Amino acid sequence: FGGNPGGFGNQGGFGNSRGGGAGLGNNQGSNMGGGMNFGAFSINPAMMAAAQAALQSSWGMMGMLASQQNQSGPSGNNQNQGNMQREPNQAFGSGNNSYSGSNSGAAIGWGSASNAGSGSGFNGGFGSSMDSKSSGWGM
Amino acid sequence: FGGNPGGFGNQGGFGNSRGGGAGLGNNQGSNMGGGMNFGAFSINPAMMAAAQAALQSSWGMMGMLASQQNQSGPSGNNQNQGNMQREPNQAFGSGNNSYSGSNSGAAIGWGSASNAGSGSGFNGGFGSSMDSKSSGWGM
Amino acid sequence: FGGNPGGFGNQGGFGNSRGGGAGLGNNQGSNMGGGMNFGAFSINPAMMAAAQAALQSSWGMMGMLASQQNQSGPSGNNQNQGNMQREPNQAFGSGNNSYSGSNSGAAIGWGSASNAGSGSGFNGGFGSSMDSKSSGWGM
Amino acid sequence: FGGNPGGFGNQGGFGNSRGGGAGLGNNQGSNMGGGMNFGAFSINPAMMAAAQAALQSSWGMMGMLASQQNQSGPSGNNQNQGNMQREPNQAFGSGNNSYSGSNSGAAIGWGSASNAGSGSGFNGGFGSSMDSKSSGWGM
Amino acid sequence: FGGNPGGFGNQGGFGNSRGGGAGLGNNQGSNMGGGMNFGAFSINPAMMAAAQAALQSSWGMMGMLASQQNQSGPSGNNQNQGNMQREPNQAFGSGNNSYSGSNSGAAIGWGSASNAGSGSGFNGGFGSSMDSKSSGWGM
């Protein structure tokens, strides 16, 4: 009860980005300021893949092909024009004006995580916690 | 109950980015300021891959192909024009005006994590924590 | 119950970026200021890969192909035109106006992490923590 | 229950960036100021790889191919035109106007980490912490 | 239960960047100011690699191919036009106007780390901490 996954045959091209002819015959790329300018993209990762346990794997692409996952923090105004306090005492948290913003990215793939906490608490912990045990052929 | 994953045959090209003809025949690249300018991209990572335990692997691309995951901090105004305090005492946290911003990137892939905390707390911990145990052929 | 993953045959080209013809026949690259200017890119990492335990591996590309993950800190104004305090005492945290910004990059790949804390707390810890145990053929 | 991963055959070219013909026949590269100007890129790292435990490895590229992960600190204005204090006492943290910015890069690959703290706290620790134990054929 | 990963055959070229013909036939490189100007790049690190435990290794490229990971510190203005203090006492931290910026690079590869702290705290520690134990054939 084992396996033998294989037996593949191709006869034509394979991932051959043959850019021919007059196409692409004149590139005029200009950049200014920050940012980037490009000319063209031909991405053809053809592949021939075999395995006997494709476990939690990815065989094409994973993350982000054309995506604007851009992040911006607070833009408003925090005005604090007076807080008459006479005498606090042992005040662990008091009188705290907090204008806070928090952003996290897309959690893509196995066992990912995006945690975003904002405000005036969150004591007693934060963040991810992962215990991974991966064994090929093993316990 | 083992395995023998293989037996692959190709006859044509393989990942051969043969850029021929008049195409690409005139590149005019200009840059100014920061940032980058490029001419063209032909990326054809064709491949022939075999394994017997493709466990938590990636065989094509993973992260980011064309992506604007750019991050900007606070842009607003924090005005603090007075806080009449007479006498605090043992004030661990008091009177704290905090204009805070926090951003994190995309967590892509296995067991990644993006934690973003912002504000006036978060004592008693922060951040990720990972215990990985990977064993090929082993326990 | 072992293995023998192999048996690959190719007959054509293999990752041969044969840039021929009139294409690319005239490059005019100009740069100014900071930043970079390039001419063209032909990246064809074709490969022939075999293994018996592809565990948490990557066999193509991983990180960032064309990406603007650029980061900017605070841009707003922090105005503090008065805080009448008569007598604090043992004030561990008090009267703190804090305009803070924090950014982190994309956490790509296995067991990565991007932590971003900003504000007026975060005592008692920060940052990642990883205990890795990898054993080939071993416990 | 061992292994023998191999048996690869190629007949054509292999990673041979044969740039022929009139293409590339006239390069005019100019630079000014800082920054860089280049002419063209033909990167074809074709390879023939075998192993018996590809554990947490990378066999193509890893980090950053074309990426603007550039970082900028604070750009706003911190105005502090008065803080009438009569008598603090044992004030560990008080009266602190702090305009702070913090950026971190992309954490790419296994067990990486990007920590970015900014503000008015973070006592009692910071930064990463890693305990790695890797054993080939061993415990 | 050992191994014998091998058996590779090539017949054509191998990483031979044969730049022939009229292409590249006229280079005109000019530089001014700082920075660099180049002519062209043909990078074809073809390779034939075998192993029996490719553990936490990299076999192609790792770090940065074309990347603007450039860093800039603060650019804003820190104005401090008065702080009427009569008598502080034992003031470990007080009256501190701090305009601070901190940047870190991309943490690429195994067990890397980029820590960036900025502000008015961070006592009681900072920075990375790593305990590595690598043993070939050993405990």
Author numbering:
A (entry chain E), B (entry chain D), C (entry chain C), D (entry chain B), E (entry chain A): 276 to 414
Sentences from the paper on this structure:
Here, we report the cryo-EM structure of amyloid formed from the entire TDP-43 low complexity domain in vitro at pH 4. Each twisted fibril consists of a single left-handed protofilament in which subunits stack along the fibril axis with a helical rise of 4.73 Å and a helical twist of −1.66°. A near-atomic-resolution structural model could be unambiguously built for the fibril core, which maps to residues 276–414 of TDP-43. The C-terminal region (residues 344–414, strands β9–β14) is characterized by a small proportion of hydrophobic amino acids. Relatively long β-strands pack mostly via polar interfaces and many residues within strands β9, β10, β11, and β13 are engaged in steric–zipper interactions. By contrast, the N-terminal region of LCD (residues 276–343, strands β1–β8) is rich in hydrophobic amino acids and contains mostly short β-strands that are not involved in steric–zipper interactions. Instead, strands and turns pack against each other in all directions, allowing non-polar side chains to be tightly packed and buried, with a hydrophobic interface between the 311–318 and 336–341 segments. The non-planar backbone conformation of TDP-43 LCD subunits (which is not unusual among amyloids) results in rugged surfaces of fibril ends with well-defined “ridges” and “grooves”. Mapping the pathogenic mutations on the structure of wild-type TDP-43 LCD fibrils revealed that ~50% of them are not compatible with this structure due to severe steric clashes within tightly packed segments of the protein, introduction of charges into the dehydrated fibril interior, or both.
Proteinaceous brain inclusions containing the transactive response DNA-binding protein of 43 kDa (TDP-43) are a pathological hallmark of amyotrophic lateral sclerosis (ALS) and frontotemporal lobar degeneration (FTLD). TDP-43 consists of an N-terminal domain, two RNA recognition motifs, and a C-terminal low-complexity domain (LCD) that maps to residues ~267–414 and is rich in Gln/Asn and Gly residues. Furthermore, recent reports indicate that these aggregates can self-propagate by the prion-like mechanism. Consistent with these findings, polypeptides corresponding to TDP-43 LCD or its fragments have been shown to form amyloid fibrils in vitro.
